[PDB]
């Protein structure tokens, strides 16, 4: 019997800062125990200061990103070159996903950018289109390895101020872009050590008011 779905592995991570946002993902593509590619880009600049990744079954992932990029193009045509805001992009992606409710895109989607007040924004989707604005979200193979670490080091969960013994929480002070990138790199370095599908390389796309910048870092290739 023919199985229309597959699993290409991969892990992605989106974090929203005060006036910035990052969307990171490893560059390794796999099936079963084989490596297809050590560098296959997974996070994409979609225009209008929006970055996107659809992790899971790569054929469905490429199809969805392609259709959204297309949706941005036609939004400009139909609405006098108006900039597609991150919230509007999110609602649009829901309709793209739910359109195939009974034969779903087998992917976990994350987009990142800035909201209309200039503040950092990340949105997260399930395969059939349910979505949420979030501060911090990992997706894919090693998501379960990364999220607990982020709860602890970004949101300071289970951390209290010394001397008070549980009475006063550690205050949630804002993180710089340099600080976030440090946590992203350590998240993927740790995931690479313990998950077989994570490795080869890490590509990070940073979004500010100035535009979209890229950073690349090597990961272990075993």
């Amino acid at each position: 019997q023919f199985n229309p779905y597959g699993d290409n592995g991969g892990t992605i991570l989106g974090i929203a800062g005060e006036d910035f946002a990052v969307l990171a993902g490893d560059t390794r593509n796999i099936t079963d125990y084989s490596i297809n590619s050590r560098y296959e880009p997974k996070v994409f600049d979609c225009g209008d200061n929006i970055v996107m990744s659809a992790n899971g079954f790569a054929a469905d992932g490429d199809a969805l990103v392609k259709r959204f990029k297309n949706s941005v193009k036609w939004y400009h045509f139909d609405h006098n070159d108006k900039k597609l805001s991150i919230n509007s992009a999110a609602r649009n992606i829901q309709h793209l996903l739910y359109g195939k409710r009974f034969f779903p895109y087998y992917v976990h989607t994350i987009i990142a950018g800035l909201d209309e007040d200039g503040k950092g924004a990340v949105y997260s989707f399930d395969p059939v289109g349910s979505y949420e604005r979030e501060q911090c979200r990992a997706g894919g193979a090693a998501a379960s390895l990364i999220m607990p670490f982020l709860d602890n080091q970004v949101n300071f969960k289970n951390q209290y101020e010394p001397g008070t013994n549980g009475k006063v929480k550690k205050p949630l002070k804002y993180l710089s872009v340099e600080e976030v990138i440090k946590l992203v790199r350590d998240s993927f370095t740790s995931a690479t050590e313990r998950h077989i599908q994570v490795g080869d390389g890490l590509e990070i796309l940073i979004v500010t008011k100035d535009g979209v910048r890229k950073e690349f870092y090597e990961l272990k290739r075993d």
């Binding site: 084989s34 549980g166 440090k182 790199r185 370095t189 050590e193 313990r194 998950h195 077989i196 272990k220």
Partner: protein, 226 residues
Amino acid sequence: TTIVGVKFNNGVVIAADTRSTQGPIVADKNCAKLHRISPKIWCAGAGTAADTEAVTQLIGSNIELHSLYTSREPRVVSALQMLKQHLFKYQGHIGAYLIVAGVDPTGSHLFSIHANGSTDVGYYLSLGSGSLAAMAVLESHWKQDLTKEEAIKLASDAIQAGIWNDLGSGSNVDVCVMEIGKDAEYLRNYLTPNVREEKQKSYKFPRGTTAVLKESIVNICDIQEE
């Protein structure tokens, strides 16, 4: 798992990677897959890790008793025969896939063993999920009359192929060289090409960070005098 065995001039060499997995998760990053059956008979195991360790120790134990009974140094063919008959009886349910190598008064030997009891003979062999990557290297560079240095090089290169290309294999290369008329030399972590880079940040917490309800001394000592 990637394991290989290579014959050379005056002996035989076996090698293995050091990754053990639970599905897609790496359980141990520096696992020891080279097992000793007797001082100069070593084997490497793939498949169910407990089975390869258990079947090695059972036969290794019985081999030692046999050696004492007969006043002779153990033979590789004895280890092979005892391993295959044990595995055949359990009809494949004991998931042990082994490459058995060693030196004895008869000479140097290299065999492999599938979990259902089938054995084969060869000058170069590979087993495990990375066996195809390893065998590709072996089929490209193997020749007759290899030296000790050449065989160690070829064996580790075959494991590296598994490390880099097979997701089931990784970390380090372990080697064991068994030469005729010499002690077997076990080279643990012969290659270390996968050290983790320094982290960007220290995650040492301030003391008093964790909330505590109760503290108490645990009595690990026995009942006291007086």
